[PDB]
Amino acid sequence: VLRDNIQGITKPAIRRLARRGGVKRISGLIYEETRGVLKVFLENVIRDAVTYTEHAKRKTVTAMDVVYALKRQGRTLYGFGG
Amino acid sequence: KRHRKVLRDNIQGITKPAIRRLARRGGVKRISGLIYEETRGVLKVFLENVIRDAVTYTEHAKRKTVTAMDVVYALKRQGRTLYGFGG
Amino acid sequence: PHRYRPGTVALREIRRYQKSTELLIRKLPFQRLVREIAQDFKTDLRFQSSAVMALQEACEAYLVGLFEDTNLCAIHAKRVTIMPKDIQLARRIRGER
Amino acid sequence: PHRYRPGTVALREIRRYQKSTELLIRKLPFQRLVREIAQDFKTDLRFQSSAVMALQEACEAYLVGLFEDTNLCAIHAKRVTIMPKDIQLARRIRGERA
Amino acid sequence: RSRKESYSIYVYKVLKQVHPDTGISSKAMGIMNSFVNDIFERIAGEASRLAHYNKRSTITSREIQTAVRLLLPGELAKHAVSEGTKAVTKYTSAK
Amino acid sequence: RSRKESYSIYVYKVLKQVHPDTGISSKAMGIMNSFVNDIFERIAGEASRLAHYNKRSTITSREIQTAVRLLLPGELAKHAVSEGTKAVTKYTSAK
Amino acid sequence: AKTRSSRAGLQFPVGRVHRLLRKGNYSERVGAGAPVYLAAVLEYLTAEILELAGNAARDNKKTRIIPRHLQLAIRNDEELNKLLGRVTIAQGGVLPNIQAVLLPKK
Amino acid sequence: AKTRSSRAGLQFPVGRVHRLLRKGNYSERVGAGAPVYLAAVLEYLTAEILELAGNAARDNKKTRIIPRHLQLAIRNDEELNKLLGRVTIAQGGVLPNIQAVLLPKK
DNA sequence: ATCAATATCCACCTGCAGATACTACCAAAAGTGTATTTGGAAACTGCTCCATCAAAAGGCATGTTCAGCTGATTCAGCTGAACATGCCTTTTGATGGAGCAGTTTCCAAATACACTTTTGGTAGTATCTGCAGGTGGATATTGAT
DNA sequence: ATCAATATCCACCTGCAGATACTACCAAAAGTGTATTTGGAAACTGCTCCATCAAAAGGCATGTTCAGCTGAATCAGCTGAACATGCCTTTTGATGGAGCAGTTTCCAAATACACTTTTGGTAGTATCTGCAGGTGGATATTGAT
Ligand SMILES: [Mg+2]
């Protein structure tokens, strides 16, 4: 039984996020839509993280690469260095 | 010096027609009548914030004149970068 | 006698003012406002006239954009009349409040 | 046969998940998604453990935030049910899109 | 092997001055580090700009002060300018 | 009177190259000038941060390039990177 | 030999901070008070946060501060929430907050 | 004597870019090829903007570029729009855009 | 209302994952002594910026009228919440080796310094041209009928 | 549809501000050419810590049922658009005066630099314990009747 990686982000999980977010009732189209948004977020962050990697001549993405990407995408993250 | 007229209630020079015009550039077709006072409050906060910072630059430069750069730098701090006045 | 129906001049104005670029607030009043506010922060301040124009170019652009977001909020709630709650929501979601 | 009314568990789940701080996406699937996405920019890449956890902390944080705004957008439209249109408005206004 | 400098220690002293019976987790201490570096960069970068805007080549405490006033909210900015002004005084008033 | 410099000349050369019959108002030229200075800072800043993250005292054309890749969007970046690499290669092979 | 920090009345490292200013390309030259000032300001803000964090750990019957406590301490303070409004505190979660219109009628 | 610009086949001033890279305190040292690249990148982007702006001048039956043409150019181009998403072009106005639901009839 | 079903709270226990504590180097702070650099303190300019007066239009304030929008009300149908569990995907924990990181080396490339040469800025005068703002007057657009 | 009111369109036409054009001075760059310094790429390799995978774990896919939410329809009320009318205030363009940005020239004060002590702060290791879960029983909340 094969599947799309993105569908790894399961309706239960998404609904949980929504609940932390204070949401009581959820349309059924939210799940796909949420997956697209999440994808665009990760594309954007990772693209920049990986760019930091390549600049360093590395084959590993370090948590600083990520922290620095987050910073510059205005999503600054505390607790992973920097 | 000799006198210099007291400024008061000058937010009311942001009139209803002017506000109506800004909204039309903003695409707005119909306007609830409580918008005018709401807008004036939102604008006053925007202006105080920008000016407070701009004057902070003026003071730091030991000047008594607020320059376009003081404003341009304030706008940048505030994530409202402005082209067309230097910098 | 002749009467345009409610909305029809409104749409006319939108086309008009979205086609032009002149500042929509009167210069002198805006200047007073700026001076009042500054004066409350520091007395005896002078203003490069271009500083005042920068401020007005900036304020007017700020509000015109606020009115765009404000409008989408009205239309989201199936209205065409922007109201204070529309401004309030737009400002919240922008992170102003 | 006992049955809670529609909304009673949901409220309950909110109260629960607002109280806790655990991540809510299962790690492995998240981790596979990271690597699929990354493969497209550069092949044969390795990820520090923490570099993947930072992402998951970031995404989850981001998405939970978007749902707050999304929820406010539904409530503006006099609903209590969040639809994609709400997400799109929120992102539009935040300046992530359009 | 090589040294990884942090603030994770000065933080702990400050924690003890403030809450002598209280301690802190690894992660918590990580957050506090990020915080300190964040604010450090913000204040430094702003000060750096001030000094460049005025063609000065020196970041003195006046730039620091102005920067603090630009970066921090009302009361926070104000208790901070006192503390910083105080510290410079005490350091100066010391043979 | 002091020499206030700007990019007005470089901007006007390039304008003639792409539209040889087209003029520019002084206000628009001001806008252009702001634009160039803005992007200069943005690139130079990302470069500065980059070299610093990787403990290099030197900003080379390699750091400019990565900065560009970080700052600019897709197609603009691709083209900027070519024009850059091209101007370097040519320069290096021109002494 | 006396540490500039002890002279200044501070736990935070005046020297280190002087160095960090020298090597971050902030300016050609650095005044002597500048790092004292800055160190003091950093310590201060650290204090205020640890203070409130502490209280939140105390309030939840705990002696060790964890990220959550920092999150509660920061987002319930108007000015710290502002200073840190574009920052994610890992493992912090969110404040309990449910919109009234979602609460059950009867 | 050849300018380094001509060496590099650029209109934009490479020397001046070098100086500014120095005086801006961005790093201790500046490789000899950075200003070259940078000035190239700026020249490219200003060619890109001028191209689209000129077009927008010609469309409005004009010979001289004004700020409104820069604004039209930047805001109709996806990528320039993004690169300049948080920038205000004085005297630029906005793009004509009326939400459909506002238009009369059905 | 009462009453059952089930979720939540609270008191107490306890092993160990994760704090706090200790030690011992040593990188990098501090101390010392010259070697630059810098930010003023005075001492003058020419500005822009303030103030103010008068004329004029161009837009603002106001009141009236009623079109049509908003929000209240009502309702049916559709659509998401709640529901029990074993199938299966994730979690956990153990193990080779990829590559990050430590170290050392040296020259291609950087700064530094004193010449030499050029260009980009401004300021003084001069010329020009694109187009802003006015003019009918021929072509829509709207709304009453 | 047809008809009249008025907004819109566009094209040509003169005054003119704002643009382009030199001219020329020159001061500040930028360039050129040695002498001097070194940052970091390059090569070697130690040892974290990351990919892989086997067994242990528990969250999720599923299909059914109907509660209650959403969106459509209708409609009475009243808010906000349009517009005519009266005239105040902003705009425009003078003119003077001066308060003050913007320079330049000399040093005392401050900060950088090369060199040596003297720790404070880190990694690696050694004890120490806060609290994450577990259980037990009381208590609160929800929903049916
Ligand atoms: Mg006042």
Residue numbers in the entry:
A (entry chain B): 21 to 102
B (entry chain F): 16 to 102
C (entry chain E): 38 to 134
D (entry chain A): 38 to 135
E (entry chain H), F (entry chain D): 28 to 122
G (entry chain G), H (entry chain C): 14 to 119
The authors write:
We generated two distinct classes of binuclears with either rigid 1,2-diphenylethylenediamide linkers, yielding three stereochemically distinct species (RR, SS, RS), or flexible methylene or polyethylene glycol amide linkers. To assess the nucleosome site selectivity of the binuclear agents, we carried out X-ray structural characterization of nucleosome core particle (NCP) crystals incubated with each of the compounds. For all of the chlorido agents, substantial adduct formation is observed first at the RU1 site, entailing bifunctional coordination of the ruthenium cation by the E61 and E64 side chains of H2A. On the other hand, for the three compounds with rigid linkers—RR, SS and RS—there is electron density between the two RAPTA groups, consistent with the linker moiety. This differential configuration allows the RR and SS agents to form bridging adducts at the RU1 and RU2 sites, thereby cross-linking the H2A and H2B histones. In this regard, modelling of the C2 structure shows that even the shortest linker would allow RU1-RU2 cross-linking. In the NCP crystals, we observe adduct formation at just one of the two symmetry-related acidic patches, as the other is effectively blocked by a crystal contact involving the H4 N-terminal tail.
Histone proteins package eukaryotic DNA into chromatin, yielding a structural hierarchy, in which nucleosomes comprise the basic repeating units. Each nucleosome consists of a core region, composed of ~146 bp wrapped around a histone octamer, which comprises two copies each of four different core histone proteins. The H3–H4 histone tetramer organizes largely the central DNA of the nucleosome core, while the two H2A–H2B histone dimers organize the outer DNA regions.
